[PDB]
Amino acid sequence: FVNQHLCGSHLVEALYLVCGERGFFYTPK
Amino acid sequence: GIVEQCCTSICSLYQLENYCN
Numbered sequence A: 001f002v003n004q005h006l007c008g009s010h011l012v013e014a015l016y017l018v019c020g021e022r023g024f025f026y027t028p029k
Numbered sequence B: 001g002i003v004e005q006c007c008t009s010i011c012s013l014y015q016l017e018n019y020c021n
Ligand SMILES: [Zn+2]
Pocket: A010
């Protein structure tokens, strides 16, 4: 896997991919 | 949370997985 700062929509797409059918929760606050 | 962990610093694949359902 990439070794880097993942921010914004890049973070979200990383989650989408890694999580599969499980889905994810994105809570940045 | 996630921003501090994976944006502010860097996350391994395992750390990213903490945010899956
Ligand atoms: Zn970009």
